[PDB]
Structures are given as C-alpha cells and as structure tokens.
Symmetry: D2
Subunit: 340 residues, 4 copies
C-alpha cells in the first residue's frame, strides 16, 4: 500500500510502499478515504516535542475510512463500517483516568501517527475500541477535521466553564478557530473573535461571531472590556505569548482561559492579576471518545462544517511547507481517491 | 477611642485618638475585642499594591467584637451581638458577580482596613449586611484569624475541585498553611505538607498530614510523584516562584493548583507542561459571606483551631517588623483588653 | 389610581380606586405599562393553595413599567428607568439560601400580587433590590411574560442538568411551553415536543422542535425511546398525573425530569423504576434575580419571543374565566394604555 | 467445585458439585475466599423482580478471592492477585453510558449472581476489566461487603450533592446504613441517624452520628427541622413508604433525597411540596468501577469498617430464612475456609 514515511526527523517524508497490516485481537484495519493534516503532524515529523516518535513511522491522526478486516473478538463494528482514526489510538482502560472518563490523560496511551503508524497511508491498523463512529449522513473529506480540530475546540469550550448566553473570545480564527466559532455558537455562546487578519475576522462574523476585533489596529482587551464587559471565557487557538497575554486581559473577573494548543516554550505570565481577578488558566488539547462522539453529532446535525482543501498524498511535504508559514486556509485533507 | 493610624506609606503607624463613629442607615458600630493582623495589612501600610489605601487610614480586616450601635433599618443583628469585620466590607449587591454568589469579585467592593477604616481601632463602623456572625461557643481571640486566614484557605480548598479521599498538597505551613491543613482534613482530604522547616512539618503531621516533605532536603515533586502518584490538588499559601513551580510538579495529570495569595510579581510559568498534562491554575484569595459562615461553623465544631499570640495594639509596628522577616508563628491578634 | 382588587376568594375582582403608594427606604414606585396574567394569579384569587393571600389584595407578578418615585438610599436605579416586578418581591438577604444565590428558597420571602400588592394596578410599590432591569431594546408588552413564564422555564431547563446537544422533551406547549422550546433551542438543546393538540405541536416545530408527538394518537414514550433513544431531560409544564408519568417514561437512564409547575395534589410515582434507571425528579418553579437577568438578556437578543394578547385592566374577570377553561393562547398581558369603549346609549 | 445452585425460584438452593470454569479471552477465574450475602441475592432466588435470573444459576455478587487462571490477553491482573467480584459483572464499553463513566447504566450490562453465575461457589469466572482490585492491607471477609453495601452507600452519598459540613440524614441503620454513617463521616458530613431501634441508633452514634432520632418515639421531621434546620441531604437505605415520606419531610428547601435501594412497589409521593420546596429525588443503587475503587481505598485507610458475621456455604438457606425476618445484624459473609461439623452417629 502507499504510505508517507518519515525516516529521519526534519527530512522530507517519502511516499513509498509498505505492507498492509492485518488485525490481531481487538484490532481492525481500515482503508482510508481521507486523512486530515495538522500542525501536530508537523511537530511529529520534526521531532520537536519532549516525547518523540520512533522513526521510521507514518504520521496522521485524522483518518476516515471503511473497515476492511476485523480481528478476533471485535463485535461492535464490522466490515464496511465507516470509522475515524483519531489522536487517541488507545488507552489502558484500568487507571483512575480511564475509569473516570478522562482517558485523554492516561499515562500509557498510544497516539495515532505518533507513537504508532497513522492515517498518512492507504490502510491503517487500529484499536477497535478507540476509533470514532462516523455518522451516516456526512462526507468523508469534510468530516475528517472534526476528528482533530473539531473535538479539540469542542472539549476546549466545555473546559471554559461557560454557559449559554455567556461571551467567549476565540483567539486565532485559523484551522481550529473557524471550527471553534461554530461550536461555540452551537453551544449557545456569544462569540467575540480576535485575530490580526481582516478576512479571517469577516469569516468569523459570517459564522455567527457578533463581535470582531483586529488586534493589530486596536487594543483587543480595552475594546472588549468596554464592548461586552469582558469575556466569561477565552479559547486561545494560536498560543503565542502575546495572544495569551491579551486573552487574559480580555476576561472579566472569574473568567476562564483555555489554551487549546501547545506553545513552543514557557512564557511569562501575569500571576499577580490572575489571582486578584479570580481567573482560571487551563489547558485542554484533545478529547475523549465521548467528546469525539458529541463533536461528530453536532457536525452531522449541520451545526458545524469544516472548510477543507483536498490534496493527494504526494503533496504532503508541500503541505507542511505552506503550514510552516501560515499559508493554509481552513484545513488540508488528503484524498485517497486522488490517484496522481 | 484609641486607633493605629497610618499617615504616610512606609512610616510607623501612630496610636492616637480618634472619634468613635456613629452608624448611618444599614450600618453598625462594633466595639472590638480582638483584631487579627496579617501580611495584607503590611501591604496596605506600605502602599505596595496597584490599587492603594488613601491615608490617613486605620488598617485591619479581622475584627471580632460586640455591636454597640445600630443604624437605621438594620434588623437582623442588634446590640450586644458578636460579629466579625472581614476583608469584604461591602459589595454593591446588584452586579452579575453579587447576584450569583460571587460578591468577592464585585468591582465596587470596599475592603476593611484598606479602602475604609478597619479593625486596628477600639471601635469600627461596619456595613451590617457584610459582617460575619460569630458562633456562640468560640473565643474571640482564637476565632479572629478565621475571618481572614480561615475563610481564605477554606474557599481556596474548595477551588481545588477535589473531593473526599483525594490528595491535596499544602505548600507553606505558616499563618495560612496550618489552618489549611485543618480545613483540608475536615473536608475529607488526605494531606501532603511541604515546607522547608522541619518543626513546621512536624506541626502539620500533628494536625493530621499523613505525608510531609522538606523541600530543602529532597525534591518534593519527585517524592510525591513516587509516594502518592501526584496530588489531585495543590494549595500554595506562600507564593514565591520556586514554591509555585514545585507545586505544579507535584500534581498528577488533571490536577488543580490554587494560589492562595498574591505573589510580588509575574513569574515564568510552565505553560507547555501545564497544557499537556491538563492542569488547571487558579487564584483564590478571599471568600464570600457564605464561605465565611461555613468556615466559622467548622471552627465552632472544633474541627479547626488557629494558633494565635495576643498583643496590645501599641505593638503593631513591632509586629510588622517581625512579619517582615518571617518571625511570626501562627497568627498575631491584637487584644483590646490588654490595657497599657 | 386604578387597581383590580380581590376582596373575597373566588369572587370577581373590583376595579376600584386606591392610593398611589410612596416609597420608604430601599423602595421604589413603578408606574405600570404592562402586566402579565397567569394561572398563579388565578390560584391567588381563588385561595387554592395551602398558604394564601390576605384579602383585600391586588394580584399580579409580571409588571413592566417606569420608576416614578425613588425611596431613601436607592442609587442603582432611578426615575424613568424601566423595571420589572416579578414573583420574588423580596427576600431577607441574610440566610443561607440568600447568601448562596438561592434566594428563591428564602423562607421569609415575599411574593408580588400574593403576599403583597402587585402589578394589577396602575402603580406598584417595590423593593428596589428585587426588580428586574428591562433591556433597552424590548417592547414592554412583549417582554412582560419573560418575568414569569420565561424565567421559570429557563431556570427549569438549567435544572435538567442537560448540555448542548442533549435531547430535552418539553411536555405541554402552552403558555410556558412555547417559551420553553425557544429557551431550549437558545441553550443548544435538541427539542422533542409532546402535547395533545396538533396545532400546538406545529407551533413547536416552527419554534425549532425537530421532533413532535401527539400523546393522544401515539404512545409518546415508545415513540421517543425508538426515535432518540430516550430524552436526557424533560421539562413538564402541564403537571397532571398522566403527563408526569409519560415524561418519566420518555427519559433515558440517568435522565432528569423537572416539574415546572405545581400539580394539584400528590400522585403515585414509579419509584422502583426511577431508582433502577438512575432517574432524577426535581421541582423548579421560579428563578433568582440572576436567572431573570439571564432570561431577559436572551429575549433582548431576539432568541426568545412570547406570544401575547393585550387587554385592558377591566377585562381581568373575563380573562380568568377563559383561563378556567383552557381558552387562552400564549399569554395574556394587561396593557395600561388600552381603554374600553362602552358605546353608550 | 462446591456451589450453591438455585434450580427453582423460591426453593432451597442445593450445595452441589459443578465444573470449575476456565477463562476465555479477557476473562479470569477467581478462587473465592469470601462471599457477601444480601437482600439482592434473596430477590434473585425468589425471582421477585420484573427482570429475573434463568435458573439454574449460582447467586452472589460480593466475592473476594485470588486469581487462579488468566485468559488470553489479560495483562493488568495476574495469578495470585486478590480481586472482587461485584454486582456489575460486565458492560459493553461502547455506549454513551459506558464512554462517559456511567457504566452502571449500560443497557447490556451483566450482573454477577443474577444474569451470570456468581460468588456463591468456590471459583468464579469473571471479566477481568470489571473486577475490583482489593487493597493489600485489608481482610478478605471484612472487605467483602464494601463490594456491594459500601460502594452503594458511597455513590449514594455522592449523589446527595452535599459538601463537607452539610447535614445528611441516614434513614435505616442496618446492613447498608451502618456503612453509610461511616462513609458520610469520612466525607466530612455531619450525620443525623434515624431508625426505630434504639441499639442501632447507639451504634450510629458510636460511628460518629452526632444526632439520632427514633421514629417510633418522636416525629423525626419535626425534630430535625427544629434541631438542624432540616438536612441538606437524605440517604434512604430502607425504602418503605413511611421512611421515604418522613425523609422528604426532614429536608430543608433545596435538599436532595437519594433512594439507595429498591422499594417493593410504587408509593404515593408529595409532588406538590417537593416542587414548592425545590427538592430533588434521585435513585442511586450501585456504583461504577471508579466508585468502587474509591470505596475500597477509604476502607483500606481505616475510615470505614463493615460489621460482618462469617458462615459456611452450607448455611445459605438458613441465612436466607433469617434475612426473611430481619434477624440479620450487619452483614453476613460466607467464608470458604469454614467447615461444618455434623457430629455423626
Ligand atoms: Zn521507508
Ligand atoms: Zn491534527
Ligand atoms: Zn489508562
Ligand atoms: Zn493622625
Ligand atoms: Zn488578614
Ligand atoms: Zn457587585
Ligand atoms: Zn405568572
Ligand atoms: Zn433569606
Ligand atoms: Zn449485595
Ligand atoms: Zn454500555
């Protein structure tokens, strides 16, 4: 089967031939129709993070396709079912985290396209108990980004501890952020969108953000303090020092900021004002099986729709380069019927 | 009446004579039996913080005493009632924070012994709707610190989002921390105490902390990771950079760190690890009327007891000096029957 | 000033002349532009409930108007401000319930148009700390029902412990229920509406209910168990024994049923199944000051709109007779600028 | 192996010989050291409930013993590990309930000693992912009741939505109730115990209940309304109509009642007052794997200790007869090392 393989961190991936896997007990093989690509896949192939892949490996944790083989003992899915291969490839199922519905925190979890081969190949070996069940009505290319961007922003909004009618700021209206506006609206929130690109901000308004502000033209924190009295919640999708700090300043007292991705390093942080104002700072970066199901249902109900561009597998190094310089709009999805 | 008056930030307070106030509508005058002193009074008299007192003023926000006059329209308390004058002097009662039981966040709150005269005088003018109602059974000197330290650590423990049977770390077993260990036990938590003083740590163990570690002799984080698998929550009572950072490292994934006081400045912060591990950082520094009532009931039930030392008002500058170099043990309380 | 006064339980109210009150400390006087009417006013004037009014009294707990006098010490509102007089007239502000944001539970509360005079008069004396602050942009007649129906169904939906994407059944799509469907949609819920009137159910669908069932034609519980796998939550706006029991049966395991009004009596209840299925049964019947503010903001955002019919004060006994036989649609609101024409002789 | 087998509902169980099972994938066999016995086993063997066992079957859902065989693919436990066989034998792992940490609600769950063979035999085949992990330090006979009574009352107290310093009433201080008082104390709650037996009530006080009331001598509700201003929560361990109704009356407004077991039938219920007072009624009858783990940790910490009486397997019909007339104190546990002495002829 065709796969994009990373042999050495920071090298181009090689489209090459590899064996189709076969499933052991508890496993399935899924033939990919589509695979999302995101910045996480870029961190994987550059070996950026403290805990790294072991090359050679196949990246990708946003695969949609049909089950072509079922392993021993699997009964809740079957051949022909359409499923999703997401970041959480497996978890132990016995620890305090797994037992309490927080399997995203399991210390022995495996991650698709990172600690094991992923969705950048024509076929993927998966743990049947951890794949997403894809709703009937949806398109495979369009739904793929829900498996990563969608579930992420959705769980991240839940982690803002906000409620219908509250105001949430979405900082950064890119790959994640355009999904975040949509989930926030579906969750009955009023949205304030902040970015530095005017078109992104128009897109946000079209997706239902009643307030927008361009951080390059205007102090976002002064404007939102005056306009909405400060946000109840903030979801920071592009974590740079400045966006984080501005997002803190955009909150009312008792507000919650959720960092929805990993910044590159530490960066100084208010503390003093943070405690005075009863602020909460939390990370949230993926979602549980149930979060992913809820995410997918919202999409199937038409409440959320990803902007995608479909490309052949062969373009994956080009795609990374464009990513390296924020040239991507919406999300990029590999389409496995594009036979170059 | 006798009062300790601050005329100029950073100068000695003068014990001097001032008029006994009389109460307008909604107010009461309380003759003090006791007044706690804490670092917040020190920040008030040094004019350390961004928003400052307007000298000349009388500090103190931990006064216990008997009502001697009642203003127009006050019916729920009356002459002779023993009440507590705490940090929260008043709040607006109309804003979203006040209406939802978060009056500690009210943007037009007044603060005793900071924005208005407080408990470092023989009598105090107070808003009848914001004083604490002192339980029958308790001693006035002993109960005073509940009005500031006790409520603070109590609400702080609530804000760790822990539950009975969880492990909480109390970092710093000093004025606040020794009360914190007791509230944590009363709330069914297992307590790990960290400090750098061996006697403080023995005291903690005597108050019910099953685990103790001296941060000077041992990496506290490595030790608690191995010993208890990481704490579910951390209450940081002495906020220096190093204690904060170590406290982060003591948490298990999904844990919550509450800062229970104000540090002096910003200080770098993990972020990256914080988000990866699904950690929450939160500030909590005082408590609502209801929190204060709940704090006081726990004390009256004998579940919590402050270590206090009673001193005459005249010693207040000496007391501040000893504070400036960590010479205080437990809490210091001004005793208004100590007549010089 | 003109007021509708109840002198004897169960008798017609008399439109008569009464002194305009003047405000003491902490109080205000509000000149009414509009007053909602509801079944709670009917229970009040019939003296139906265990704890009753003391006649003579002026009913009404859904008044919207402008402040015309401000008492001593009141500073957060002022003359000309538009405010709402609601069921919770006052609470003590000192008890556990009041301190914890649950003033609706205060054992010494007062209730507008029940334990003190209310909104069925051209002016009303009120406690300044308990009136609702009416958003700028709304109409006074249209907004009045938010003070009672809206806040009730809003807080009741919060009390279902559901979340966006969950399914809630609204049982009874009448005065309350039509507002309930709108709030439930604004709160990101999927809505299944149940009633026994087809037109009510069409209205519900128009308000965004994706699923509807006529309990007369079809077993509502069997249908919703098959169709949505059981609701996560149920809000019972018309509490008869049969609606209550069916609503229980419409829930999935771990679901929550909220009774949003007072039934007439006891009525047997499942228990056994309720405990087996991990079901929660809860009452929620009004809302705090903050719940009311949040309700009102939703309305002002255009997310909720009450169906109303405006009438002159002098129709209040006709209104109650219609109510006595389920003839009302939406809500009725007294409009203080509407006049009679007697067409004299 | 020796097993107590129920062949016909309502008949004596037969101690007879049955094959030791062998484990398939995902399964283990556990050699029992101890087995609790409770009213749920009695309902099972009488075939009392709407959904019943399929005889012949081996009852028991409180087994403690050592793994003697491990099936294919099992890695998180191993031979010689001490584990607990509890009511929740298995769940699907794939539905909304299972994925959200509410596996106790799973519609395709299996129940030990009810829908599959349980702990009334010397060996039990179990699903490795659902057995409890027994802390090192505890005794096997003493810990067995935690697997059923303990987890039940523990999760039930969590479901009262109380917090440390609140007042909870434990109604019925028997098998479940005497554990409930200990858990409630460990959870920082003040405890009011109610029952109709003075000795039970003294025991409760000894376990830390600072308030007690004998419902036969005194109106429990009037007393607790005066004494503590009404409880925040109530846990009803013996569900008869009268206990349930009195427990409702013991709550303050906004209070929560949890029914911790299954009454025999429906029984009228307040509603009207319930909704007026903002009261919540909830069933909670067992616990998740995590609840069970937490229960067990509290016991191992010395915070909770079950009163038990150890008996040989062969007494199981005698045990059920004593149960049939409330002759049991604390809990009964079968101890697999205990032997009869027939004193033969
Ligand atoms: Zn290769
Ligand atoms: Zn991704
Ligand atoms: Zn795990
Ligand atoms: Zn002076
Ligand atoms: Zn202080
Ligand atoms: Zn305020
Ligand atoms: Zn009404
Ligand atoms: Zn009150
Ligand atoms: Zn049992
Ligand atoms: Zn299941």
């Amino acid at each position: 089967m065709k796969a994009a393989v990373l042999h050495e961190f920071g090298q181009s991936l090689q489209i090459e031939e590899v064996d189709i896997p076969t499933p052991g007990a508890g496993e399935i093989v899924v033939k990919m129709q589509a695979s999302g690509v995101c910045h996480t896949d870029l961190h994987a192939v550059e070996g950026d993070w403290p805990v790294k892949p072991s090359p050679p490996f196949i990246p990708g944790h946003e695969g949609v396709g049909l089950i072509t083989a079922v392993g021993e003992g699997v009964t809740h899915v079957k051949e022909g079912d359409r499923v999703g291969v997401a970041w959480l490839y497996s978890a132990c199922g016995h620890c305090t985290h797994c037992l309490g519905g927080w399997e995203t925190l399991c210390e022995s979890q495996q991650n698709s396209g990172y600690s094991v081969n992923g969705s950048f190949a024509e076929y993927v070996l998966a743990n049947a108990n951890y794949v997403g069940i894809i709703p009937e009505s949806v398109d495979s290319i369009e739904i793929a980004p829900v498996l990563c961007a969608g579930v992420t922003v959705y769980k991240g909004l839940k982690m803002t501890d906000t409620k219908p009618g509250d105001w949430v700021v979405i900082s950064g209206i890119g790959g994640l952020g355009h999904m975040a506006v949509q989930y926030a609206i579906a969750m009955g929130l009023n949205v304030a969108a902040v970015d530095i690109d005017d078109d992104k901000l128009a897109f946000a308004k079209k997706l239902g953000a009643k307030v927008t502000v361009n951080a390059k033209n205007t102090d976002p924190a002064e404007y939102l303090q005056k306009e909405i009295g400060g946000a109840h919640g903030a979801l920071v999708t592009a974590v740079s020092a400045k966006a984080f700090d501005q997002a803190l300043s955009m909150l009312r007292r008792g507000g919650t900021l959720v960092c929805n991705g990993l910044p590159p390093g530490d960066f100084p942080v208010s503390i003093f004002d943070t405690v005075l104002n009863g602020i909460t700072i939390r990370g949230s970066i993926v979602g549980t099986r149930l979060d992913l199901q809820e995410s997918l249902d919202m999409a199937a109900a038409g409440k959320v729709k990803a902007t995608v561009t479909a490309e052949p597998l062969e373009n994956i190094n080009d795609i990374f380069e464009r990513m390296r310089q924020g040239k991507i709009e919406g999300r990029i999805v590999i389409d496995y019927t594009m036979l170059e």
